[PDB]
Structure formats: structure tokens, C-alpha cells
Design a protein around this ligand. Structure first.
Ligand SMILES: Nc1ncnc2c1ncn2[C@@H]1O[C@H](COP(=O)(O)OP(=O)(O)OP(=O)(O)O)[C@@H](O)[C@H]1O
Ligand SMILES: Nc1ncnc2c1ncn2[C@@H]1O[C@H](COP(=O)(O)OP(=O)(O)OP(=O)(O)O)[C@@H](O)[C@H]1O
Ligand SMILES: [Mg+2]
Ligand SMILES: [Mg+2]
Lengths: 240, 470, 56, 475, 474, 119
């Protein structure tokens, strides 16, 4: 796939997208053939040359002065263990990463994306603007505070805690459900047709949740929706 | 005599073939001294220790310095014996390496010095001592609440700031001055920046004249780090055996001695065991500690620092070392902030010699009450952190009064602190501290200002120091 | 009311002492299980590595 | 019958030649040092060295003794300090033995064995009353480091003076100073005249530590089959397991859990199962064993501790945190049990203390709830008082054994409610004061229990115990 | 003789038969022109590590002996160029035009040639200068996890050394080449490249060159050190070096242990790190100083390579992920950061000013972790908890903006002296930049003295200046 | 064999219902281990009382235990075993104390063992 995409980048000069599906299966194949080639084993039953092969493939996938390859890849985390060698080595070669968690998928929050572990080099004030960055980091404080507070709630109980601690749990529930969205490929999986939210709208809405304007609405209306306008109507059907 | 050649090299490991079949024994040492024949070659001056007889007249060897530049077909020569270092009065005050060479720019020790082996058969059961003796260190907290024992292994758990280097030098000064015995410092794996600072402080404290030091650096191949205690040890055996005097051995961190053994087992090839350590952890650990015992002529006592691998005393390495120790002293940063020197925690330090048949009953009782007094004070500390003193009962206020004096009287004015502070410093015999603490514990001296007890010696010094205020 | 409020605060104090003592005991019991496991995994990975190395 | 060595690494060695060797033979090197033949590959014999290996070179000489692993036995060994091989260590010259026995004996079979019925009186109140040991029971003393494990065995050997027993002490892995000290302690109490001490200290090559517990029972079985009763103590079986783990790895035998190979259960059983109470046809003799285990973190649940808890007929569990609250010796009654116990008590003691466990088991658990507990019912408050005296009644001191007739009398008082009158701190003085009162005044009660192994007149004893209580004073 | 022939070729490791006079650590030249290093000497076969593309080496091809130990080119001409681990130019711009060479397997300066660290390294980061001092000659570990701030911590250090008489080297190991281009580009713009060297080992290269990359970087810096100028070195991941040796060994069949890292790992990492020293006056008083980086998975401080680098250094700066996602930036955990030589590498003023801060931070750690919730309480605890919070803000700082030392001592004198109590916690960030404006326009006398005397001025004058500003502030 | 056909409906509703009470007790194990039973409310309190009764009423006196404890043994026929659990589950024996439910055979034995205590 890469030699075709390289010819279009270099000689024709048009800009290009590359989609590679499950690049872990490249790393996994080497292991199978390593023992029969005569190589001694390393770490968790892996080839002695893991970082090399990943480097040779990955360092070809670049945007040169001639033309640009935007590259999107799926990686499978070998045994639900992000501390495994194949994902760890891969993490060094990316500009943006989204990590998917089964705990969120069990709660039904789709797409199931970790808002803390997913980071990109472009969340800098200059490359996205001061208003965008302010809202983004402030959401990340709310969700990290909810994580530590869940331990205290699970053993001692929610009523035991302060008004500021209560208001964090209030907002964090809404923020986490409002990160879920109705996709077109979720038409087959969920009945409802689907939505596209422009960036300006996303910033307005998340700012309202943080400032408390929409806190009167019941939490169940923030699941699998696109724009904040829709959330107001969905609540009306419930009767609020 | 027989000269061998090198037929293999990989990192620290080398193999030699001895074609006649006249071969070296399992811990002997071999020299490579070679002059470069052509400008492509690099001159080499290496030495190697034997490890296995692999067969077909070949021997596996660990190397004591860097093996770069080796060309198979090199010539190697056999000394007929283990590594041997010089022993006697020649060693006092000078710093040496594993090979026994002097690192100091203070000349070279001569050929005539008697040189004796690193590896030797351990002391026998017809040679040891029947009855325990207690060693008087002159330090109040150590002699009172955690008595050291002659022939004992003592353990120092501490880091930076709390001040290991002051405690080591004061012990070397008290034993040399009063008990008339030398010391040895063997810093297995000492950080180089630390060796230089230590040599300057040992010199500038005046302690150097009574001590001999071996330094094995981190940048040496693992076999050098492992045998470095075994040379500091063989120097101390001479004094006890002949000079008959009692001797003191300091080891910088025992953990690096075990870890070097692990790295050598991996190079040689032995299968790893529990948590990756060498198959032979005990037979290596045991063969070093058992030399440190009290024979009839005299004794070796040792202060050894240990670093717990992951705060897990259950890990294979602490469990084998904690098998051998007889007393434990913890240094805690908190005390070293309030003003107590030496900063040793009375309630986390323990000994197997604090028993009425070893110390005697009057010493045992005085020590037991002091710990009871302090433990009750610590309960009141968390109450005093929330609330005022007069909110306690008068029974708890009496516990605070006496405990605060005891903690300060536990402190002491050291001699090796003289350079830093004008105060001269003092040595206290065990009978004088046992008598004094009995007087504080009846309250005979309670009509005195608190700071009267700070950095003082005998209890009668408090009387006079009080008058000084007025 | 003065007896009732004095006896309450006292009750909370007693429960909290016992609650903290149960929690600290559970921390040492749990800590040893973690150490036992960490030692266990390390031995397993080493033995699987050396078993393949012995085969090849 | 002569061969030459070819590889000599880390204890394990191999030798080319020796075509006819036997598994378990003795082989002698040119050094005068000894070895054991354990394996036979088609051209090379595998030898384990039992001595200093620093003179053994490739191409050196190893010769056949001609005998199976054999340990010297005879009456001359009693009172001498010896090696695992029959070699004297104390000085004092040769051992002057007469004959030998294999160290790979078969155990006594079923139908060649009889059930137990005679006591092994330890003179320790908690062990004799709560956790009986019969002659021939196999019992494991298990506790964390520095909990008194050695304290219990020596108290037993001194008390086994009066009774016609032979006692052997086998020190595996211990520090040499602690062993020399034990011999001087045994000589001072006069114990050495009827005992053998066998030493394998931590500086030695691992092979003599491994053969050491086995050697201990090869000396004791000689006396057992001749009819006299014997006791054996093993000072650390968990250090015997470590030495096998090293001997197997260098050998390259494949790994197990932790790293112990699968023959750990076979190793420990070969040793323990040799202990038997022989029947009247065999002359009614007995071996008896006290293995020791040290456990990490004071937890009963771990690999080697659970293997030895499987082979024995009970266990005695010692707690470090009991011992540091000062109780000596300290014994958790809930995790300590005797499976052959109940036949091994004298008749007066069965009647007196089959119930002490009820006071102790229940009291230890109860004080946990009550400390945190808001309220106690009168029934709970009473249980507590009785329990309180038992713990103080089970506290003892080092090197002071109590004769069994005096044990049943102090336990009768406490189990009869008279002792409740005395205050906690005064109970200890009363026990000393009672034992003295019995020596001077109450001789008739002491003659009956010894002679008829049975409780004397309750009315005389009640009368007698009230008479002592009048003379006693408080605080 | 000096010619041999290749018998096995694979994955970088090409065994060869012949070459009887080779040394361990020599250079050997293949016919293709690629070089290689001999690292194993079996009884019949030399084991050769290829330091270049291997697709052109076939079995039976001839390999010839260079005759020289592994050597790295050094000279003044390397400054301002982007180079390979071998002395080969990468930025384009033509040859490096070096004059001489050094071994990459040098001995470390021994005892009696070293002195006590006596002088500071001003990083311009408020927390790193005040709380965790590095002095010339120290070995400092930055240990943390992916996406916490690590590369940022190092870059700010280079920029803040512009005025000082310093030389700095950056050794980029295993990193994606666009990231090395971003870093080089960032420094150029700040004018930093004029006095610095970047040594690059991208992820596409054979693992042997990643292994030599940290050694080549110290071998360049030691040349300037023995000539007398002070030098600083940053290694961009020592965990990525570790891995390259593991790969370059397991292919040569050396025995393995722990997480399959060969038995030389402590001998490898230590030799590189110990080269750093503050030579003594006889040696001309030069200094290296070193900043290794280690990345830890799920913060396993107990792993094999992490246990090893935490030991060889003279301190550590442990960075935590939750502090970052909580507004503390740089995310430096005060409890787990340690300095063995701390107390000598600060100017006299900062020593006197900073002692209270380390104690104040420790009290907040213990007390707040229970009592944030309980407000209606003893006034002593309420006052103590205020200083903790304000201190955390005064330690917060922005990206790519270093602060000169005289200004750091003045804001910390305020926080320690407690003039800041009246000011709410929130606007301390903006206020800290602004007190800076008032000081520049009005207080030139106090600043002139600090730089010149490394000492603090008269208290009455300082109290007067700060009290007067507290009147102006609203 | 715990199938409605093989063991019968009566032995079936009773067996599953016993398992349902006990499984809830394991979930409540890790809360009551710290705070105690003040945190528990309503159904939590009633469930822990009945679980304590059930767990001790599964313990028996064996004829082979006579060599360890002096008590005589007991044989409980199945019709008695199934019948006994029902009365515990209904709550008909809520008043009797937990120490009377240990080492007994058929249910009646608990009533006389309680009457010996008088609690
Ligand atoms: N009943 C007792 N009363 C008073 N002191 C005792 C008593 N029992 C033992 N001691 C003392 O308490 C300490 C217990 O340590 P000891 O060496 O006897 O324990 P151990 O478990 O046998 O040691 P080890 O781990 O080496 O096997 C010793 O100082 C011993 O002399
Ligand atoms: N002090 C800071 N202020 C603001 N943003 C920061 C700061 N430090 C780091 N960041 C941001 O957070 C990330 C830190 O990047 P950095 O290179 O330190 O991560 P890293 O995972 O340590 O890198 P590497 O993999 O090279 O070690 C970047 O997105 C950066 O812009
Ligand atoms: Mg013992
Ligand atoms: Mg970075």
C-alpha cells in the first residue's frame, strides 16, 4: 500500500490519505516466523528485532517538501495491556493518538475515548487559539478530579462530601456523556440517523456545561447526540 | 612456569587454553601484560580470575578491568595463587583497589610487604568464643537502647542528610582512642564524586591515620565490584589474628555486592532463580558474613548499610542479609531537623542483645522504661498537633516533660564535630549513661531548663551547664 | 441537648479511630499480596524466556 | 574402577570413566575429599562434591570407595560434635565407631507400625496442655524469624533428662556462633551426656547441608531398631529446600513454582516418613521428629510452609506480634493443632485440660470484638476473666521446665474457679508460691498422680487448694 | 592475515570467519564501504555488528580491518551542525571538516583528579533552581512517563544558558526525525544553534548506531572539558539505548536475564554516566554535567533499567501525570525529587532565601491531604494551608520562557517572608509577572547588587521596596 | 443434579434461594470490612442477619469427629434438611442467637441449644 501512496506523493505531487488497518498484525507475523528463522526469543515471546522493523516501515510514512501523506492507523493493544512492547514502541512514532477503553464501552459511552490518555502535539495555544485551549484543559481538570473522587464515593458514599465536590460530580457526569455521539455507521447499530458538529459549535456547548447554564436538564439526555440544541429537545420529550 | 593463551572474548568474560594440561585452580588469578608489536595493536595490562573448568583443557574467567583491545593469541600468565593484597602497618592511612594497588598518589607499597589471599577457608568451631561480649562505643543512644555486640553484624538503614559520614568517623575515633583498634572502609560500588569527598573529609577530620580504605568504582566490570569486600575483609583478618586487637569493618552498600553476583551469574550462564537472582545467593552471602566473628584472640564487628529493593523485606536479597544481622539502627531525617545528633530513632532500632542475661537487669529495665515513655509521648504528639498542652491530663503532661528531656539527653557532643563547632565533645562509659538515665527516670533533676540537656555528656555536666545560664 | 451533642461527637470519634485502624491493617495485608505477585510475575517471564532460549 | 574429572564447576562435577558406578555411591578424590555419584550418562558419571573443591582440577583422580552412601553409627558418638560425614569436629580425637548404615533407608511399613500411647512431656504448659506430642508424632514448629523456635527444642531436650530418651540436634544453615553457644548451654545444664549435635553451617558447600537432615535420622534409627526411644530436631527445613534448589539448577534440572523443582515434596517426605512407633514384634521402639519452618511475613499460606504442613501429624504456629507484646513462648491456639493428640496425654491431664482450649480459643478471639465493642453482657464479662488468667497461666520463662504433676495441679485450680480470686499481676507469684507449697507441704497429692497417673481425691484437692489460698496474700 | 570472509548475514549481525588479529572494539570495513564493529570473538568465528545498511552484504564477500579502535571525530567545526553518531554530516551543508579523533571507550577521570561541586547551573525554571539543585559536575536523572513534560524541561535549560559561558550538546536517540527537525528549528529561532551540537539517531537506523549515539555525544564533550570550558550533555532516552543493546546482543546469542537485558547493562549505563566530573585545578578546572532521561511504564520505578539509572546518578527529578492534568506545570513532585550534592550549587542569596520553602511544601503535602474539606478549624492549620497553595502557584511557570536568578530570589523572598498573604491564590500567576514590571522600572539598585555580590541586600531596604509595591497593587 | 426434574421443585426453589442470599453477602464483605454495619441500610441489615444464620446452620457434628471433640455425631435426612432451610429463610427463627446455630444436626437441636444459653 505504501509504494502506491509514495508514487502519488512524489511523482504526481497530489496530497494523499493512507488508511492502514490493524498494524499490530504486521508485528505479530514476525514472531511466528522468528523461531523457524533461528532467532532466540526476547521479552514476552517477541522477535529480537521489534523496534527495527517498526522503524523501517514507520519512517517511510512521511510528508515531504514535495507532498503530504495524512496517515490514519488502527493498532490492537495485544492483551488489554498498554504496557506491552508492541504498543509502547509504536507510541513514540505518532503526532496524535486516541486510546479506546473497554470500561467506557461497558457504560455505553460511544465512541469510548480516554479524554486524559489521548493527547496530540497540536493542543498548543498558537495552533488552536486561546479560547479553545482554555476550555480544553479545564475539561481535563474536571475529569481527573472525578477519577480520584470515585474511590471515596464507592466506599464512604456521595452524601458525605462538600458542595464543591458535589458540583464536580454533577458536571463531570454531564461532560462524560456529552462526549458521546450519533454516527452514520451507528445507523445500522442504533436506529437514529446521525450528526456532524462543526468545531465552533463544540466550543460553545462545552463552555455552557462548564459555566452551569444547562445543569437543570436531566443527565440521561446527553447520550449519543450531536449538538447542544438537540439535548434541549430530547429533554422536552422526557417531560422536563 | 606454565603460560596460557586467550581463545575467546565476549564483554567481561574470557577463555584460556592451557595445552600441557597443567591448569590453574578455581579462584586463582592471571596476568596479561603485553607490549604492542605493530601500530595497529593497543598495549594491555589486564588481570583475570578463574571461575570454571569447562573441559578440553580450557578455563572460563571473569575480568577485573576493561577487555577492549584484546587479540586472541594474546599470552596470559598464572600467579599460582588467588589475588593477594599487602597487610600490616603499611596499609594504615592509604587507599587501595581490588588488586591491592595504591590509587593515592602517595608512592608504591614495596615488594617485601607480606601479601595474603582474598579467598581463604572460613574460621572453625574449635576457634570461636563461648560467651557474648558487648562493645562500648561511647555513643549514648547506641549503647543504651540498641547495644552493639562484639562479633556482630549491625545494619544502617539511611540516605543523605541524616549524616552517615559523621557517625562512621566518630565510631572510628572512639574505638581507636579508647579500645585501641583500627578500622577498614570498603565502599563496594561507591559513586566516584563520593570517594573524593570522603578522602578529603577523612583527612581533614584527622581520622585517616587509624583507617585503611578500599574503593571499587561503579565503572568497573562486575567481578571487581564483587571481590572488593573480600579484600577489605582480608586486611582486617590480619589485625585480629596477629595484632590481636579488635577491628571494625565498614561496607558501603551490601546490595551492590549481591547484584554484582547476579550479573556474573548471567554472564557465566547459570539459570536465573527467584526474582532473577543468582542460583547461589546464600552460599555467596554466607561465605562472606561468617568470616566476621569473635575468635578467642580478638573480634571483627561490622557496620553494613542495606537498601531494601522495593520496600519489600520479603524479597530474596533482604531475607538472606537479615538472616545474619544482630542489631539494626535507623537514621530518620525528621530528627536531623529539630537538632538531635546523632539522629537515630529510639523506637525503630532494635538488638538481640537487649536481654537481661546479656546486658544485666538494671540496664534492661532502664531501657524498657525509656521506650515506654517515648511511645506514650508519640500518642500525645498527634493530640498536641490538634490542641494545646494544658488540654491534656497532668499524667500525660508529665510524660511530655520527661520525654522531651530524654530525647535531648540522648543527643551528644561528638569530637569529629569539633572542626565545625568550637565545642570539644565527650565519651560516655555505659555505666555512666545507665546511672544517669536512672536519675532522670526518678525525676531527681526535673527542676532544670529544657535546653540544659542539649548536646551534653554525663548527667553532672547538665548541673554545671545549668549554672551557666544562671 | 448538651448531653446529646457531647455524646454524638464522641460517637463519631470512636467510629473514626476503629475505621482508620481497620483501613491501615487492610493496607499491610494487601501490600503483601502485591509484593507476592510482583515476585511471581518476574519469575514467570524469565522462565518462559529461558525455555525458548534452551530450545534454540 | 578409576576415572578422571572433565568438568568441575560450582560444586556439580562430571567424570569420564567409572563404567560400573552405582546411583548413590561414595567416591574419593586425590585431595582426600569425598563425593556422591548421582547420575550415569553413557560415557560420563555425574558427581556432587562433599568437601573443598579448590584442589580438584580437570584430569585429576576420583576413586571408588566400594560402599553405598553410608553413615557411621555406634554408642561412641554420644557426647561428640560431628560432621554430616562421620568426622569429629569438636577436637577430642576420633569418634571410634563400629559399623555403618545407609542414608537411603526404607521407612517402616503399615503392619510394621503401631498406634501411639506414650507421652513426650515437653515441660511447656501451652504445648503439653493444648497441643500434645506423643512419642512418634511428627510435629512442625513454624514461625517467623526470632520467635523462639530454638527456645522450644532446647527446653524439651533438658526436660528429656529424667526420661530414658536419646536426643539428636541437627543444625542446618545456622550461624556457627549460635551452635557453639548451644553446646556450652547443653554442657552447663548437664544435657550433653545423652545427646549428639550434628552441624551443617552456612559457609559449607550445599551438598553437605542437603545430606544433613537425612544423616540425623540415620544415627537415630540405629537406636530405634534396638528398642530405645529417640527424638530428632531439624533446625531449618526451608534452608534444606534452598540448598536443593541450587543443586538442581546448576545440575540444570528444569524449573517449578518459585524455582523449586518438583522433587521438593519427595525430598521432605523421604525424611519425615522414616519416623515410626514400632510395634511389639519390632521391640516397641520409637523415632520422633520436630522439623522447623521459617515463613516470610508471618503468613501460614505459602509453598514450602504448606508442603511441610502436609507431611506432619499436626503443627505449632508461633506469632511474632504475640512475642513482641512480650508473651513467651507465644502460640496461636487456632492455627495450631495435633492430629495424633488425644491418646498421647496422661489420664489426669485428659480430664483436666480437654477444656483449656475452650477458654483459650474463645478468649483470644473475644478480646478483639470487645476492645472495639460498645457493650458486654455479664456472660461475656465472665468469659473474659477466666480467659485472662489462662494467658498468664500459659506464660513461662526460658530454661525452666515444670514437672507434669505440677502442671495438672495448676490447671485444675484455674479450671476449678478458685484461681479467679487472685489478681492478674499476682497470678505469676501464686504459681511460684503454689509449686513451693506443694514441695514443702502437699506431698500426698504429688505422690498419687505420679504413681497412678490419675487425678487424686477432688475433696482432698479442694480442701488443699482452699488451705493454700488462706496462706497466700495479695499486693 | 588481515582479510576475512562473511559466512552468516542477518538482521545487522554478520558473523565472519578469519580476521585472526582483530580486537574487541575494532572497526572493520566491508567491500560495500559500510563499516562494522567486532563485539564477539568465538573460537572459530568473529561476530561483527554492521553500522550501516546491510542489504548489500552477501555471504563470501570480503571484510577488511581498519586497524583502529572505534574513534569519533572532534573539533571546533562540529559546532552548529547536525551530525550522525559516526562523524558524518546530515543537515546537508557539506563536510564537518574536523581535525582529530577520540576513542568512544575512554576511562573516567579517577579519584584525586576531582573536586567538590562548587558552582551553580541556572536552568531558569523556578522549581528546578530553588527546589532541586544541579551543580556543574552532577549527574541528574529526569525520569517520567510518555506525554509528561520531559523534552520541554531540557530545552528550556539550553536557552537559559545563552549569557553564561557554557557549551551544550543534545543527543536525540530513537526519536521520529520530524521531531528532531522541530527541536532543531525551535532552537535556531531562539538563536541557540550558534553554540550547540545536535547528534541524531533516528528510529530507522540499525540499533547499533542508537547504542553508539550516547557514547559519541560524551566523546565530543570530553574534548572541550579537558581543554577547560564547561560543557552540558542531554540524552533524549536511555531506555531506547538499552533496547538497542538488547537487540544487538540477543542476535549474537549472548546469555539473557531479567527482562532479557544482557548481563552488561549496569556496566554499559554506568561507564557512560560516570565520565561527568568537575575536574580539579590541576586539570584546568573543566566540567561535564549530564542529564539522562528514562521513560517508565505505569510509573514502575522498580523495573530493571529504571532501578539501574536511579542509582548511578547524584539525584532524580520524578515527574507525575496527574499533576500535569491538574495545572501544576512543570509537573515536578517535590517528595520524590532528591539531590545528593544539594546545598552548594546555589548562589549565597538563594541558599538563605530557599531553606523555608522546602519545609513549607512538606507541611502542605501532609496537612492538605487530609484537611482541605474542614474549613471551620484551628487558625494555625488554616494559615499553614494558605502558604502551601500560594507556593504551588509561585512554582508554576509557562513553556519556553526562562527566568533569570535575581528575579527568582526576589519572588521567593516574598513568598517565604509572607508579604503575599493579602493577595488571593488565583491571580498570583499574573501578579508574579507584574511585580517584575515594578522591579525593573523602580528597583534597579536591589537588582544591581544581587548579580554583583551573589548576596542579599539590607533587609530594611527590601522591606521598604516590597511594602511600597503592596501599596500600589490592587 | 440441582435440576428441577432430578431433585424436585421443592428442593429447587430452596437451593437457589440459599445461593442468592449468600452471593449478596460476598458483595457486602468488602464494605462491612471497613466501616461495620452502620453504613448498611434496610435490606442490607436483614440480609446480613439471615446470611449469618444460614452459614452456621450448614455446619454439622460428625461421628468421625469424636476423636477430636467429645460431642456425638448426627445424620440429617434430606426431607429434614430441605424443611429446615425454609424456616430460616422465612424468618421464623429470627430471635435465636448465632452461637446456637453451630455443630448441630436437625433444626430442633438449635432450639434446645439456645435454651441451654437462655440468650
Ligand atoms: N520464654 C522466654 N522468656 C524469656 N526470654 C525468652 C524466652 N524464649 C526466648 N527468649 C529470648 O528471646 C529471644 C528469642 O529469639 P530466639 O533466638 O530464641 O528465637 P528463634 O525463633 O529460636 O530464632 P531463630 O529464628 O534463629 O530460629 C532470644 O533473645 C531468647 O533468648
Ligand atoms: N511547561 C509546560 N507548559 C505547557 N505545555 C507543556 C509544558 N510541558 C510540556 N507541555 C506540553 O505537553 C507535552 C509535553 O511534550 P514532551 O516532549 O515533554 O512529552 P514527552 O512524552 O516527555 O516527550 P518524549 O517522548 O520526547 O520524552 C507537549 O504537548 C507540550 O506542548
Ligand atoms: Mg534458631
Ligand atoms: Mg519530547
Amino acid at each position: 500500500g505504501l509504494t502506491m501512496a509514495e508514487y502519488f506523493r512524489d511523482e504526481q505531487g497530489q496530497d494523499v490519505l493512507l488508511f492502514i488497518d490493524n498494524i499490530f498484525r504486521f508485528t505479530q507475523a514476525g514472531s511466528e516466523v522468528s523461531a523457524l528463522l533461528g532467532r532466540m526469543p526476547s521479552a514476552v515471546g517477541y522477535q529480537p528485532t521489534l523496534a527495527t522493523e517498526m522503524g523501517q516501515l514507520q519512517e517511510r510514512i512521511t510528508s515531504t517538501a514535495k507532498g503530504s501523506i495524512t496517515s490514519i492507523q488502527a493498532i490492537y493493544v495485544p492483551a488489554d495491556d498498554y504496557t506491552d512492547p508492541a504498543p509502547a514502541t509504536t507510541f513514540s512514532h505518532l503526532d496524535a493518538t486516541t486510546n479506546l477503553e473497554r470500561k467506557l464501552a461497558e457504560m455505553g459511552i460511544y465512541p469510548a475515548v480516554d479524554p486524559l490518555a489521548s493527547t496530540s502535539r497540536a493542543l498548543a495555544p498558537e495552533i488552536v487559539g486561546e479560547e479553545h485551549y482554555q476550555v480544553a484543559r479545564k475539561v481535563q481538570q474536571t475529569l481527573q478530579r472525578y477519577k480520584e473522587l470515585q474511590d471515596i464515593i464507592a466506599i464512604l458514599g456521595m452524601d458525605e462530601l462538600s458542595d464543591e465536590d458535589k458540583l464536580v460530580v454533577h458536571r463531570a457526569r454531564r461532560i462524560q456523556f456529552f462526549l458521546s455521539q450519533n454516527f452514520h455507521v451507528a445507523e445500522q447499530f442504533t436506529g437514529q440517523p446521525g450528526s456532524y458538529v462543526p468545531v465552533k459549535e463544540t466550543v460553545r456547548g462545552f463552555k455552557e456545561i462548564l459555566e452551569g447554564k444547562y445543569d437543570h436538564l436531566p443527565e440521561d439526555a446527553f447520550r449519543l447526540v450531536g449538538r447542544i440544541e438537540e439535548v434541549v429537545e430530547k429533554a422536552k420529550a422526557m417531560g422536563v | 612456569m606454565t603460560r596460557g593463551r586467550v581463545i575467546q572474548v565476549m564483554g567481561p568474560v574470557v577463555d584460556v587454553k592451557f595445552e600441557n594440561g597443567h591448569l590453574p585452580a578455581i579462584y586463582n588469578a592471571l596476568k596479561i601484560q603485553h607490549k604492542a608489536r605493530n601500530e595497529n595493536e593497543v598495549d594491555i595490562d589486564l588481570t583475570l580470575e578463574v571461575a570454571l573448568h569447562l573441559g578440553d583443557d580450557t578455563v572460563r574467567t571473569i575480568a577485573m578491568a576493561s577487555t577492549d583491545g584484546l587479540i586472541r593469541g594474546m599470552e596470559v600468565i598464572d600467579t599460582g595463587a588467588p589475588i593477594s593484597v599487602p597487610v600490616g602497618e603499611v596499609t594504615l592511612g592509604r587507599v587501595f583497589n581490588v588488586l591491592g594497588e595504591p590509587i593515592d598518589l602517595e608512592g608504591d607499597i614495596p615488594a617485601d610487604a607480606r601479601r595474603d589471599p582474598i579467598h581463604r577457608p572460613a574460621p572453625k568451631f574449635e576457634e570461636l568464643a563461648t560467651e557474648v561480649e558487648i562493645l562500648e562505643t561511647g555513643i549514648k543512644v547506641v549503647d543504651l537502647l540498641a547495644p552493639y555486640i562484639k562479633g556482630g553484624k549491625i545494619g544502617l538503614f539511611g540516605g543523605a542528610g541524616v549524616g552517615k559520614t559523621v557517625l562512621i568517623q566518630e565510631l572510628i575515633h572512639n574505638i581507636a582512642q579508647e579500645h585501641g583498634g583500627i578500622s577498614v572502609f570498603a565502599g563496594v560500588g561507591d559513586r566516584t564524586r563520593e570517594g573524593n569527598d570522603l578522602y578529603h573529609e577523612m583527612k581533614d577530620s584527622g581520622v585517616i591515620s587509624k583507617t585503611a580504605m578500599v574503593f571499587g568504582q561503579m565503572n568497573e566490570p562486575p567481578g571487581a565490584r564483587m571481590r572488593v569486600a573480600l579484600t577489605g575483609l582480608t586486611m582486617a583478618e590480619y589485625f585480629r589474628d596477629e595484632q590481636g586487637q579488635d577491628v571494625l569493618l565498614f561496607i558501603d552498600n551490601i546490595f551492590r555486592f549481591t547484584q554484582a553476583g547476579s550479573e556474573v551469574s548471567a554472564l557465566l550462564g547459570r539459570m536465573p532463580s527467584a526474582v532473577g537472582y543468582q542460583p547461589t545467593l546464600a552460599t555467596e552471602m554466607g561465605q562472606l558474613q561468617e568470616r566476621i566473628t569473635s575468635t578467642a584472640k580478638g573480634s571483627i564487628t561490622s557496620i553494613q548499610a542495606i537498601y531494601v529493593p522495593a520496600d519489600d523485606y520479603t524479597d530474596p536479597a533482604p531475607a538472606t542479609t537479615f538472616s545474619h544481622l544482630d542489631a539494626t539502627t535507623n537514621l530518620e531525617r525528621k530528627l536531623a531537623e529539630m537538632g538531635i545528633y546523632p539522629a537515630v530513632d529510639p523506637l525503630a532500632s532494635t538488638s538481640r542483645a537487649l536481654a537481661p542475661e546479656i546486658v544485666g537487669e538494671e540496664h534492661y529495665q532502664v531501657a524498657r522504661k525509656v521506650q515506654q515513655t517515648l511511645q506514650r509521648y508519640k500518642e500525645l504528639q498527634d493530640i498536641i498537633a490538634i490542641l494545646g498542652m494544658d488540654e491534656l491530663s497532668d499524667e500525660d503532661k508529665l510524660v511530655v516533660h520527661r520525654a522531651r528531656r530524654i530525647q535531648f539527653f540522648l543527643s551528644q557532643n561528638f569530637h569529629v564535630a569539633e572542626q565545625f563547632t568550637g565545642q570539644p565533645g565527650s565519651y560516655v562509659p555505659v555505666k555512666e549513661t545507665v546511672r544517669g538515665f536512672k536519675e532522670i527516670l526518678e525525676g531527681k533533676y526535673d527542676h532544670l531548663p529544657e535546653d540544659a540537656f542539649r548536646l551534653v555528656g554525663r548527667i553532672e555536666e547538665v548541673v554545671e551547664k545549668a549554672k551557666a545560664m544562671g | 441537648l448538651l448531653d446529646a451533642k457531647a455524646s454524638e461527637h464522641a460517637a463519631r470519634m470512636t467510629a473514626m479511630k476503629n475505621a482508620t485502624d481497620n483501613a491501615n491493617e487492610l493496607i499491610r495485608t494487601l501490600t503483601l499480596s502485591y509484593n507476592r505477585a510482583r515476585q511471581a510475575a518476574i519469575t514467570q517471564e524469565i522462565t518462559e524466556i529461558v525455555a525458548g532460549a534452551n530450545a534454540l | 574402577d578409576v576415572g578422571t574429572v572433565i568438568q568441575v564447576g560450582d560444586g556439580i562435577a562430571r567424570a569420564h570413566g567409572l563404567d560400573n558406578v552405582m546411583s548413590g555411591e561414595l567416591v574419593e578424590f586425590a585431595n582426600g575429599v569425598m563425593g556422591m555419584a548421582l547420575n550415569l550418562e553413557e560415557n560420563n558419571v555425574g558427581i556432587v562434591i562433599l568437601g573443598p573443591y579448590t584442589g580438584i582440577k580437570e584430569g585429576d583422580e576420583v576413586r571408588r570407595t566400594g560402599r553405598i552412601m553410608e553413615v557411621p553409627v555406634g554408642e561412641a558418638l554420644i557426647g561428640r560434635v560431628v560432621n554430616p560425614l562421620g568426622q569429629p569436629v569438636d577436637g577430642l580425637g576420633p569418634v571410634e565407631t563400629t559399623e555403618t548404615r545407609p542414608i537411603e533407608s526404607r521407612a517402616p511399613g503399615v503392619m510394621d507400625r503401631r498406634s501411639v500411647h506414650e507421652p513426650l512431656q515437653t515441660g511447656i504448659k501451652a504445648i503439653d496442655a493444648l497441643v500434645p506430642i506423643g512419642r512418634g508424632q511428627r510435629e512442625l514448629i513454624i514461625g517467623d524469624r526470632q520467635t523462639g523456635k530454638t527456645s522450644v527444642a532446647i527446653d524439651t531436650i533438658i526436660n528429656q533428662k529424667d526420661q530414658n530418651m536419646i536426643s539428636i540436634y541437627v543444625a542446618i544453615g545456622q550461624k556457627e556462633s549460635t551452635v557453639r553457644t548451644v553446646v556450652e548451654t547443653l554442657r552447663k545444664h548437664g544435657a550433653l551426656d545423652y545427646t549428639i549435635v550434628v552441624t551443617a553451617s552456612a559457609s559449607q558447600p550445599a551438598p553437605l547441608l542437603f545430606l544433613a537432615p537425612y544423616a540425623g535420622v540415620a544415627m537415630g534409627e540405629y537406636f530405634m531398631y534396638k528398642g530405645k526411644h529417640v527424638l530428632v530436631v531439624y533446625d531449618d527445613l526451608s534452608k534444606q529446600a534452598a540448598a536443593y534448589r541450587e543443586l538442581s539448577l546448576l545440575l540444570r534440572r528444569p524449573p517449578g513454582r518459585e524455582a523449586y523443582p518438583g522433587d521438593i515434596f519427595y525430598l521432605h517426605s523421604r525424611l519425615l516418613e522414616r519416623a515410626a512407633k514400632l510395634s511389639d514384634a519390632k521391640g516397641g521402639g520409637s523415632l520422633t521428629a520436630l522439623p522447623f519452618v521459617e515463613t516470610q511475613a508471618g503468613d501460614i499460606s505459602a509453598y514450602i510452609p504448606t508442603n511441610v504442613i502436609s507431611i506432619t501429624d499436626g503443627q505449632i504456629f508461633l506469632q511474632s506480634d504475640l512475642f513482641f507484646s512480650g508473651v513467651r513462648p507465644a502460640i496461636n491456639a487456632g492455627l495450631s493443632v495435633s492430629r495424633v493428640g488425644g491418646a498421647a496425654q496422661i489420664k489426669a491431664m485428659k480430664k483436666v485440660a480437654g477444656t483449656l482450649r475452650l477458654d483459650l480459643a474463645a478468649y483470644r478471639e473475644l478480646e478483639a470484638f470487645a476492645q472495639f465493642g460498645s457493650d458486654l453482657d455479664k456472660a461475656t464479662q465472665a468469659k473474659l476473666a477466666r480467659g485472662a488468667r489462662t494467658v498468664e497461666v500459659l506464660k513461662q520463662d526460658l530454661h525452666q521446665p515444670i514437672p507434669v504433676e505440677k502442671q495438672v495441679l495448676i490447671i485444675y485450680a484455674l479450671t476449678r474457679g478458685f484461681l479467679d480470686d487472685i489478681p492478674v499481676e499476682d497470678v505469676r507469684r501464686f504459681e511460684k508460691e503454689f509449686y513451693l507449697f506443694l514441695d514443702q507441704n502437699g506431698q500426698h497429692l504429688l505422690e498419687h498422680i505420679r504413681t497412678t497417673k490419675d487425678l487424686p481425691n477432688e475433696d482432698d484437692l479442694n480442701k488443699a487448694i482452699e488451705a493454700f489460698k488462706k496462706t497466700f496474700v495479695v499486693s
